[PDB]
């Protein structure tokens, strides 16, 4: 789990994905998988190209690696999560390690488009992600 939730309209974000995610991935109907995780960073990890394997047969049609870390995140990483949602097929599920660098780059662009930022803190939080420690970053892309 119940860690895939709904940032926005066409938008979910989790932690990382599994093998075992493929029926509620299939239950709802996603059709983007963007992974915003580098590869390797535990050794645990399933590789995007294994993600994309597996959840080719969930139902799922696009499938982009656009792997940051919350640290790097920089202007181009933000508009290229935009363009990569304007142009997907709905709904979208974007995921990480914990689905913090996901609602970071849904976030730097609400707060760029003049969201408050204790809203985009109380949004992320409902699903799942709390970004408190990020807000003096938040305020500054405003
Ligand atoms: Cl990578």
């Keep these: ?27 709802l ?3 983007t998988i963007i992974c915003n995780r580098p590869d390797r960073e535990e050794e645990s990890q399933p590789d995007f190209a ?7 047969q969930a139902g ?17 990483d933000v508009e290229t999560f935009r363009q990569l949602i304007g142009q997907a097929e709905y709904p979208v599920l974007a995921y990480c390690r914990t689905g913090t660098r996901c609602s ?13 930022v204790d809203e985009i803190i109380r949004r992320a939080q409902a699903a799942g992600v709390n970004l408190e420690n990020f807000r003096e970053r938040l305020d500054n892309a405003r």
Aim: aromatic letters at 8%; glycine letters at 6%; a positive charge.
């Design 104 to 116: 970071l780059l849904w976030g730097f662009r609400r707060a760029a488009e003049g969201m408050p």
């Design 60 to 76: 799922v049609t696009g499938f982009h690696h656009q792997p940051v870390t919350a640290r790097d995140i920089q202007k181009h």
């Design 29 to 31: 109907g996603i059709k």
């Design 1 to 27: 789990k119940m860690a895939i939730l709904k940032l926005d309209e066409h938008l979910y974000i989790s932690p990382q994905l599994t093998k075992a995610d493929a029926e509620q991935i299939a239950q």
């Design 50 to 56: 294994q993600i994309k394997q597996w959840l080719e």
